[PDB]
Amino acid sequence: ASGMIVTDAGADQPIVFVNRAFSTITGYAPNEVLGRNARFLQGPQTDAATVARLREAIAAARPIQERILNYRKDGQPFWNQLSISPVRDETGNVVAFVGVNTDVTA
């Protein structure tokens, strides 16, 4: 169904966990993405304005939803319905980010 990406909150948000659906959608195994920023999913037809909105939202730890053009490991484009939210503790500290991916290419 829907992919899930968990990243660290700091140091440019390296991936720390992906679910099985993430591999189904993107063609990447966990081994191939752990420790990397998720921006490797982008490529030349990705909308720069959309990437800028993601960058500013993540810097502010503000939830954001975007439809963004991404690329499978072998280079096949797909439309990623992407929702990112910070994970906060009760003091308001950001512990992680969680991203949900749906392939909406259909």
Ligand X SMILES: Cc1cc2nc3c(=O)[nH]c(=O)nc-3n(C[C@H](O)[C@H](O)[C@H](O)COP(=O)(O)O)c2cc1C
From ligand X, a second copy, none, which one binds at residue 58 (CB under 5 to 8 Å depending on kind)? ligand X
Tell me how far apart the alpha carbons of residues 6 and 15 are, in angstroms, rounded to a whole number: 6
From ligand X, a second copy, none, which one binds at residue 68 (CB under 5 to 8 Å depending on kind)? ligand X
> Using CA of residue 44, residue 46, residue 47, residue 51, what is the dihedral sign?
negative
Q: Does 29 bind a second copy (CB under 8 A)?
A: no
Q: Does 105 bind a second copy (CB under 8 A)?
A: no
Please choose, out of 27-35, 50-58, 71-79, 87-95, the segment that lies near ligand X by the rule CB under 6 A.
Answer: 50-58
CB burial of residue 18 (10 Å; 0-12, 13-18, 19+)? buried
Residue 32 CB, nearest approach to ligand X (Å): 14
Residue 15 CB, nearest approach to ligand X (Å): 8
User: CA 79, 25, 29, 86: dihedral to nearest 10 degrees?
Assistant: 70
Q: Does 103 bind a second copy (CB under 8 A)?
A: yes
What residues numbered 61-80 form the site for ligand X, per CB under 6 A? 68, 70, 80
| Phi and psi torsions of 23, nearest 5° | -65, -40
